[PDB]
Structure 1
């Protein structure tokens, strides 16, 4: 019946296709994981089109713990080890062009700095107010997380392989469920899709990335 609720966004393959196009157009999407996993919907944006206004929306509508999903190669490049001996690294801040690091603009500056393919460890102070996540190799076919869905979506869309996520939260602090996620998506012109949709699509189109 999640399946049935999502029918106004199309069938599974169409739900992926439209999410890919929204991303290529610099818009965001809403990605749900398995109902028996976190059963949460995250706003997802591409780093390369990311704006202050998009970041502000995440902060105002989501948990506020905005994460940067990176490939393992990029995380390694940044010398970001895991926070602890979900693949949270130590937290990060831009050294240049920010103040406290927490404003929407500051977080976006931090994020663009980290996602740069020419980035260096020393571009980033640690700890900070952006929370990077290492996407596992293989993506959603290997681990069915929002982290992997984020990076696969960018890759599948032909975009810089870095994205930001944050979990949609209702005003009263409870986590948003499918009906709320659907309404939020229609109000914000953001396609909704599931991790399972992405799994099926990758295989259906022989998408090794």
Structure 2
């Protein structure tokens, strides 16, 4: 079962603690959601430590639809409305980029958007970076990779902005627990679940 497969990453509390330390070290983590939800694994990176190499791995090994998980406050600061009456309108840096799709341009757009001093005019719309508004309460309100990203950053003591993308197998199928475990071992990325995070937050009265 999933718990048996992830037991080599440790018990749920150790899986959360190892992931938080990986992010504090500027490294990525793999977050699995519920098996009855998407049963999908996402590469997660802190924006504060984001590099062109990390973005290039995400584009090469994931869907290529790299999402920028922001707080509702940061999304409001950037005047980002929902795309349709939690994908917001897509975004590009107004300055510092060319076509916007290059790993470097996506990082330039992500850093511009996550800047706590950012202004809406810093971002042109539409673009090739997809911001997602995290629900207030995080995984304790909505059990999605969007909320897991903000909560991982807040619990690691980092800026509440992270990038996520769905790990995709070479044949186009979406990675399932065994493929995610192998990818994490190969790329030294800790693997954890939203369930691990929810129980960690409830046990450590972790209001964020």
- TM-score, normalising length: structure 1: 0.99
Coordinate RMSD, CA, aligned: 0.3
Aligned to 2:150, the other structure's residue is in SS state helix
The CA distance in 1 between the partners of 2:22 and 2:170, in whole Å, is: 26
Question: Residues 58-96 of structure 1: CA distance to partner in whole angstroms, max 9, x if unpaired?
Answer: 0000000000000000000000000000x1000000011
The CA distance in 1 between the partners of 2:78 and 2:135, in whole Å, is: 16
The CA distance in 2 between the partners of 1:113 and 1:100, in whole Å, is: 16
Q: CA deviation at 1:12?
A: 0.2
Q: CA deviation at 1:11?
A: 0.2
Question: Residues 133-159 of structure 1: CA distance to partner in whole angstroms, max 9, x if unpaired?
Answer: 000000000000000000000000000
Question: Residues 151-187 of structure 1: CA distance to partner in whole angstroms, max 9, x if unpaired?
Answer: 0000000000000000000000000000000000000
Question: Residues 92-135 of structure 1: CA distance to partner in whole angstroms, max 9, x if unpaired?
Answer: 00011100000000000000000000000000000000000000
Aligned to 1:96, the other structure's residue is in SS state coil
Pair 1:78 & 2:115 matched: no
The CA distance in 1 between the partners of 2:71 and 2:79, in whole Å, is: 12
Runs (5+) with no aligned partner, structure 1: none
The CA distance in 1 between the partners of 2:196 and 2:166, in whole Å, is: 19
Runs (5+) with no aligned partner, structure 2: none
- TM-score, normalising length: structure 2: 1.00
The CA distance in 1 between the partners of 2:130 and 2:158, in whole Å, is: 21
The CA distance in 2 between the partners of 1:7 and 1:186, in whole Å, is: 13
Aligned to 1:176, the other structure's residue is in SS state coil
